[PDB]
């Protein structure tokens, strides 16, 4: 469990790797994988869609049941559901969608949810269709998360920009 390999330590507790988060979950067998969720837990693309596809749609079926029973999450909020074949747990975290006018200050609230878990495999929050600057998202992660977070970034050019941002 939690067999993280080949990460670069950026801070006392934040690590980064140029990797596919689904292939990392399969290799590492983490206690927790973080999903970059939306408030209705509709896993239609990006990391959410990739995680769901790797679970053979189990995540989406579980999420649909959760939302019909319990209602939507809030921006900045989270829920813990099954990790299925990826992890023990999946922490579904909703970062703000600034492309849709939501407040970037809620990215702090989103990352605060990571402090309820000793170690996490995670993507950067509010990246991709959520529209936040990835360098800013890494900064908020570093400033907010105090537990051990292993970040997976798929795209090499973005990984390099983030690592350079950070150590040069
Ligand atoms: N001190 C240190 C630095 C980097 C690391 O990256 C890993 O993949 C596993 C543990 C680790 C420990």
Author numbering: 3 to 170
What does the study report here?
The severe acute respiratory syndrome coronavirus 2 (SARS-CoV-2) macrodomain within the nonstructural protein 3 counteracts host-mediated antiviral adenosine diphosphate–ribosylation signaling. The coronaviral conserved macrodomain (called “Mac1” here; also known as “S2-MacroD” or “X domain”) is encoded as part of the nonstructural protein 3 (Nsp3), a 200-kDa multidomain protein. Viral macrodomains recognize and remove host-derived adenosine diphosphate (ADP)–ribosylation, a posttranslational modification of host and pathogen proteins.
Of these, 221 were identified using P43 crystals (hit rate of 8.8%) and 13 using C2 crystals (hit rate of 5.6%). We identified seven fragments from the C2 crystal form and six from the P43 crystal form; none of the C2-derived fragments were found again when the UCSF libraries were rescreened under the P43 crystal condition. The inconsistency of fragment binding to different crystal systems of the same protein is apparent when comparing fragments that resulted in high-quality datasets in both the P43 and C2 crystal systems. Unexpectedly, only 5 of 59 possible fragments were observed in both systems, with 3 fragments binding with equivalent poses in the adenine subsite. This observation points to the value of having multiple measurements, and even multiple crystal systems when they are available, in fragment-based drug discovery approaches.
